[PDB]
Amino acid sequence: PDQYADGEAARVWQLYIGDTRSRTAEYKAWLLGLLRQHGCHRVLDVACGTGVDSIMLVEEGFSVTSVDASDKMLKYALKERWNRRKEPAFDKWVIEEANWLTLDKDVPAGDGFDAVICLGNSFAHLPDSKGDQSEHRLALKNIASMVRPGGLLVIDHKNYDYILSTGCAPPGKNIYYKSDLTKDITTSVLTVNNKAHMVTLDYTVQVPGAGRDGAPGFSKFRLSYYPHCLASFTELVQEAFGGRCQHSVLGDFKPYRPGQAYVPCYFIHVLKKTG
Amino acid sequence: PDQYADGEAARVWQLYIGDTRSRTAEYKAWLLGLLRQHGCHRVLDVACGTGVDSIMLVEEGFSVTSVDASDKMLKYALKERWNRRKEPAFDKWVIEEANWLTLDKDVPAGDGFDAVICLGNSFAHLPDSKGDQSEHRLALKNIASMVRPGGLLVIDHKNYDYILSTGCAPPGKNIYYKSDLTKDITTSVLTVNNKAHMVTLDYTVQVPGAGRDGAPGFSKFRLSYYPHCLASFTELVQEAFGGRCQHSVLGDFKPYRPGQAYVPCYFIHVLKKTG
Amino acid sequence: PDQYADGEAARVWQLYIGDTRSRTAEYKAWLLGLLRQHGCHRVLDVACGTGVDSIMLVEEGFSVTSVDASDKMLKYALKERWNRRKEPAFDKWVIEEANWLTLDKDVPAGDGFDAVICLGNSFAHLPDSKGDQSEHRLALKNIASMVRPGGLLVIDHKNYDYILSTGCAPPGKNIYYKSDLTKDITTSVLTVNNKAHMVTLDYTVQVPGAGRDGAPGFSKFRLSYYPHCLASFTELVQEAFGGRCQHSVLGDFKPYRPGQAYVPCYFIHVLKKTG
Amino acid sequence: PDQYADGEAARVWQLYIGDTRSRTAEYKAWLLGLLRQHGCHRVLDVACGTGVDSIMLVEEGFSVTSVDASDKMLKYALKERWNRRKEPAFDKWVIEEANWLTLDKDVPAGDGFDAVICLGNSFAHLPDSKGDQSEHRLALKNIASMVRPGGLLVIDHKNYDYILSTGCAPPGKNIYYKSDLTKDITTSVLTVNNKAHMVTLDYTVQVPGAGRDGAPGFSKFRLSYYPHCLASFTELVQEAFGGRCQHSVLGDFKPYRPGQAYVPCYFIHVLKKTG
Ligand SMILES: C[S@@+](CC[C@H](N)C(=O)[O-])C[C@H]1O[C@@H](n2cnc3c(N)ncnc32)[C@H](O)[C@@H]1O
Ligand SMILES: C[S@@+](CC[C@H](N)C(=O)[O-])C[C@H]1O[C@@H](n2cnc3c(N)ncnc32)[C@H](O)[C@@H]1O
Ligand SMILES: C[S@@+](CC[C@H](N)C(=O)[O-])C[C@H]1O[C@@H](n2cnc3c(N)ncnc32)[C@H](O)[C@@H]1O
Ligand SMILES: C[S@@+](CC[C@H](N)C(=O)[O-])C[C@H]1O[C@@H](n2cnc3c(N)ncnc32)[C@H](O)[C@@H]1O
């Protein structure tokens, strides 16, 4: 189900994300570069969310059409495009509901897109409901299909290898989500038959105010992720392109070499479809 | 929550347990031997259940009073009593409801029992719902207070150390549950905040028949236990008697020496009150 | 759904019913008289419940076998039996589980009973979940089939005609339930597609004590019945015996003539199998 | 709670409404007339829903700012304003979330509005949660407060007098909702202590396609209303204006005289606040 249905997460996301100028500060020069370095104007955002990155591309004047499964979150991307409905770029910003699993129809690529982006550890949200990675394969497949030949694919996932290994994630220098308000996170790892199956996080977001000066009282929600490990996604994602693609994985938007000292929080998988 | 409220476990429990014969085959000697060695006549079975173990001691001429929290299970025990209500022993059997959490008031020990047995890995059914082993430490105490000075306490639990170590329990030499009817059992360990909070298994007891020869359709029920580790249980159980006790831990009805090659399926803890 | 699964009704049922004395005070004469008039020795109580009515007949030297679908309730009957298990009559009492919907296989009548009683407005507990009185018409049948040719069937129900008529039931002269402890009972009638589908009432049994003298805190439970109207029940019940029966309907343990000024609180239906 | 939370009703509303050109055909000339006959340009729509009527007013060039409690429905109003964002009238169409109960703040009228509209039997959606019509009074009150002195108020409610009396509504010539797809409606009336309290309708909407040519398979949802009777709303609504207002009720947008032959589906209450 849409873990964002109760729109409580989407309610504090602005806060949950933390500083946008800062969150976006990291990797903004690299994405905009890579996207331009391959000369892509047509960009589809499959995890638009509230639209933090889409808006960025809109502003940097690309042709972005963004989709997302939760209208609760989308609802906000929408508000922005409206407030900025006078800005020509934004008058052309596209926002539609869509689901990776049924994307094939949800968003007719036909021509395809110059680049496809699925940032902020979204895909990890898709669960292994069937036991087999069937769905994951399908989802990934449909995304790969949105990229025009020679197009790109920028998808990532938190470093679950480190999180699973030390049973705890590496917080601090977390590029996508840093807020002085996240007062609590209770991690819950459920492994079945010795296979990590679900990682459930119970959040506590400190909403400014909460009554008198500096007083407890926050917003709570919970998100569950699949702990995708590098090796597996690497292959899995590649297999999505039918093998006809160029694969490249980064640490936290820096070159990543297996067995390296630095432990990245996320793993940015960049893909170039050749067929 | 009462794992037996739906009454799926009890209805086929008889099969789940298997041949009481082979069930009792083993330690009916051991058990009978340990209570007698300490001259235990008045026994209290805080985990009566279907009544298996309680019935025996009864049949073996003991003064037994058995209590359980689940009437669905207790009722079958009761059932047996009525059937054999002409036999003086049985007419002398006491079957009643009680809950470890409130044992102190449910079953008025006053003087105490010669030996209180909690066999069957019944304790591991008690969750740590509070988060801190408060309830456990509590239940274990109340029980302990039913044991008279010098008396005994025989409480066991599966070997969750190995289970938790390998993510998979060892199915073999199950002295308490052995059948040809178990068709589906899968392991799901759930650990929160880096601590194993619970172990879930899905049970499928193929009840004789299920249609013509060669037809599916058996009873379905799954259970969830608390992976109690040796060390913690050892500590946990002895504090129940406030340190005034003689602790003894056995492998599979055999002494247990740490590091010993043998992998015990269960762990039988034997205590002797001294205060 | 089993209205007694939570076991709130039974726990205080004793109080809900009131003084069995006054309870039985009335129709213990009536009942005792009707069965004897037809020389009914072997009786089956398909609504045993706590065992109130069943116990009496037993105490009144009858050959009674009682069944009920709710063990929570049956257990208390059972309890009684064990307590008085030395009295030949009781040791001869049969208490078992059964469900009208499947009575035919639950209780093997074979020969049949002299008289089958279903007093207490127990039937109105059976909802029309299907939409069509399919289940009712069914349950009523299975019951009927437990009655031997010439035997009897005494099944009753509250006067839902008046209830449904005035939206409010008449609280007075309750031969089955009279107490000073009932603190809250509100009427909610639900009719779908222009037909009264259900009547719901909220029960509050003020259990003695609830703290010091003058302190709230009683048990809380509410029930829902099927407003069975006279006509339909008359029709419904007779068809159960396939027209081959002698129907008789009484007011409040008194004959009932349509239009009669008196408002019966209950309706006792008396049938005599002739086929 | 927002009965439109599962947005399934909002999903088929387009179909549920039926033909808009037709639905709007009735009463379009009358509303546009009365709104102009009193020269109102500033109109607030408190039950915007998908915005069927707001859009109308927008198109007919009025100054409409529409609010509604369910963002699921609002979501669609929004989509339209965007598609027609190039249309000057529409570029100024206002859509915000708001709840009658807390309207006072949700929408600052201050100046107030020339006219307020609450059509399509929306208000009936507000339940009597407190037993007293408290909430109803508050809600209504807040709405009355949105109307500028001399402003108007057009609120309606289905004819529950006829529905309640014949336990069945008068379908056919239903102005607001007529679709050749509504394959099923199961009415459920719940009266408590002889007072109609809730009318629950379980809908079945035939969504074109459903597989092969003409094949079953529809969308289902359920709405619950309060059965407001003419007399009561008349007074209730008037009292909302503090008595300082002009009251007028129509049948189906035609003069309505008590005890009249023609039985209306809806009762259009038109109000003129004078103070
Ligand atoms: C963590 S949020 C993204 C936040 C945003 N990317 C950012 O960086 O702030 C994950 C998003 O994944 C989307 N999502 C999850 N499963 C999806 C699916 N199957 N199809 C489409 N979107 C999905 C959700 O609706 C949610 O907005
Ligand atoms: C595995 S069963 C026992 C089976 C039985 N030992 C045998 O060998 O057939 C565990 C029992 O623990 C009991 N139990 C669990 N929590 C309890 C509690 N708090 N108080 C009393 N009994 C409890 C249940 O009612 C259940 O019958
Ligand atoms: C009001 S109680 C009877 C109380 C009892 N007559 C007395 O006077 O105390 C109704 C009984 O109907 C029984 N009952 C309801 N549906 C049943 C069914 N389908 N089969 C058997 N018993 C059923 C319940 O278990 C419940 O005990
Ligand atoms: C039947 S729909 C309206 C359809 C639309 N008026 C038409 O004619 O097609 C009723 C609307 O009332 C709204 N509603 C219900 N209770 C509300 C409240 N307390 N405040 C604001 N809107 C409310 C819902 O969100 C829903 O859109």
Q: Helix crossing, C52-59 with C28-37: angle to 10°?
A: 60
Report the 10 Å Cβ neighbour count for C1: 7
> C175 CB under 6 A from ligand 3?
no
First-to-last C-alpha distance (Å) of chain B? 34
- Side by side, the strands of the sheet bearing A94-97 are A94-97, A63-68, A42-45, A113-118, A147-158, A266-273, A245-250
Give the chain D residue whose CA is nearest to the CA of A74: D75
By the CB < 8 Å criterion, does D60 face chain A? no
- The count of residues in chain C is 275
Token couple for A191:
């492994």
Kindly give, in sequence order, each residue whose CB lies less than 8 Å from that of residue C182, ignoring residues fewer than 6 positions away. C16, C203, C204, C205, C206
> C68 CB under 6 A from ligand 3?
yes
Q: DSSP states of D106-142 as a string?
A: HS--TT-EEEEEETTT-GGGS--TTSSSHHHHHHHHH
d(CA A226, CA A232) in angstroms, rounded, equals 12
Which ligand is located closest to the Cα atom of residue D74?
4
Closest CB to B186 among A187, A189, A192: A192
Closest CB to C190 among D167, D188, D195: D188
Please state the separation of Cα C268 from the chain's center in Å: 10
Which chain A residues are within 8 Å of B168, Cβ to Cβ? 193-194
Beta strands at D63-68 and C266-272: parallel, antiparallel or unpaired? unpaired
d(CA C157, CA C227) in angstroms, rounded, equals 9
Establish whether chain B is in contact with chain A, requiring a minimum of 3 CB pairs below 8 angstroms. Answer: yes
The per-residue b/e assignment along A104-124, b for 16 or more CB within 10 angstroms, e otherwise, is: eebbebeebbbbbbbbbbbbb
SS3 track for chain B: CCCCCCCHHHHHHHHHHECHHHHHHCCHHHHHHHHHHCCCCEEEECCCCCCHHHHHHHHCCCEEEEEECCHHHHHHHHHHHHHCCCCHHHHCCEEEECCHHHHHHHCCCCCCEEEEEECCCCHHHCCCCCCCCHHHHHHHHHHHCCEEEEEEEEEEEECHHHHHHHCCCCCCCCCCCECCCECCCCEEEEEECCEEEEEEEEEEECCCCCCCCCCCCCEEEEEEECCCCHHHHHHHHHHHCCCCECCEEECCCCECCCCCCCCCCEEEEEEEECC
Beta strands at C94-97 and C63-68: parallel, antiparallel or unpaired? parallel
The residue among D160, D208, D158 whose CA lies nearest residue D183 is: D208
Kindly give, in sequence order, each residue whose CB lies less than 8 Å from that of residue A225, ignoring residues fewer than 6 positions away. A121, A124, A125, A158, A160, A198, A199, A200, A201
Give the Å distance between the CA of C45 and the centre of ligand 3: 10
d(CA D127, CA D135) in angstroms, rounded, equals 8
Per the CB < 8 Å rule, is A190 touching B190?
A: yes
Token couple for A120:
């902020």
Give the Å distance between the CA of C47 and the centre of ligand 3: 4
d(CA D15, CA D22) in angstroms, rounded, equals 13
For chain B, residues classed under CATH 3.30.46.10 are 1-16+159-225
> B120 CB under 6 A from ligand 2?
yes
The residue among D126, D101, D120, D168 whose CA lies nearest residue D23 is: D120
d(CA B112, CA B99) in angstroms, rounded, equals 17
Which ligand is located closest to the Cα atom of residue C266?
3
CATH class of domain segment(s) A1-16+159-225: alpha beta
Q: How far, in Å, are A46, A115, A153, A263, D163 from residue A271 at the CA level?
A: 15, 9, 5, 22, 63
For chain C, residues classed under CATH 3.40.50.150 are 17-158+226-275
Q: What is the resolution of this structure in A?
A: 3.0
| C-beta of residue B150 within 8 angstroms of C-beta of residue B244 | no
**What does residue D100 show for φ and ψ, rounded to 5 degrees?**
-40, -50
- B158: which strand partners? B266
Beta strands at A113-118 and B63-68: parallel, antiparallel or unpaired? unpaired
d(CA C35, CA C151) in angstroms, rounded, equals 9
d(CA D124, CA C42) in angstroms, rounded, equals 58
Q: Is A185 exposed, middle or buried, given 0-12, 13-18 or 19+ CB atoms closer than 10 A? A: middle
Which chain D residues are within 8 Å of A78, Cβ to Cβ? 78
Pocket mutation for ligand 2, best pick of B68, B75, B158 (most atoms within 8 Å of C-beta): B68
d(CA A3, CA A70) in angstroms, rounded, equals 8
d(CA D90, CA D88) in angstroms, rounded, equals 5
> B126 CB under 6 A from ligand 2?
yes
**What does residue B42 show for φ and ψ, rounded to 5 degrees?**
-85, 105
The residue among C153, C179, C181, C157 whose CA lies nearest residue C169 is: C157
Which chain A residues are within 8 Å of D71, Cβ to Cβ? 75
> D237 CB under 6 A from ligand 4?
no
d(CA C82, CA C191) in angstroms, rounded, equals 44
By the CB < 8 Å criterion, does D161 face chain A? no
Q: Is A56 exposed, middle or buried, given 0-12, 13-18 or 19+ CB atoms closer than 10 A? A: middle
CATH class of domain segment(s) B17-158+226-275: alpha beta
3-state helix, strand, coil in chain D (%, to 5): 35, 30, 40
The residue among D112, D159, D160 whose CA lies nearest residue D274 is: D112
Give the minimum alpha-carbon distance from D87 to chain A in angstroms, rounded to a whole number.
13
Token couple for D80:
């339209």
Give the Å distance between the CA of B184 and the centre of ligand 3: 36
Q: Which of A187, A190, A194 to mutate to test the interface with B (most CBs of B within 10 A)?
A: A190
Which residue's CA lies nearest to atom 13 of ligand 1?
A47
Which chain C residues are within 8 Å of D168, Cβ to Cβ? 194
Which chain C residues are within 8 Å of B78, Cβ to Cβ? 75, 78, 82
**What does residue D24 show for φ and ψ, rounded to 5 degrees?**
-75, -30
d(CA D231, CA A122) in angstroms, rounded, equals 55
Closest CB to C167 among D166, D167, D193: D193
> B14 CB under 6 A from ligand 2?
no
Which chain B residues are within 8 Å of A201, Cβ to Cβ? none
Closest CB to B189 among A167, A168, A191: A191
Give the Å distance between the CA of D48 and the centre of ligand 4: 7
Q: How far, in Å, are C69, D21, D134, D237 from residue D242 at the CA level?
A: 58, 37, 15, 9
Please state the separation of Cα C238 from the chain's center in Å: 18
By the CB < 8 Å criterion, does A186 face chain B? yes
**What does residue A274 show for φ and ψ, rounded to 5 degrees?**
-110, -15
d(CA C8, CA C42) in angstroms, rounded, equals 32
d(CA D77, CA D90) in angstroms, rounded, equals 11
| C-beta of residue A180 within 8 angstroms of C-beta of residue A18 | yes
Which ligand is located closest to the Cα atom of residue C73?
3
Per the CB < 8 Å rule, is B187 touching A193?
A: yes
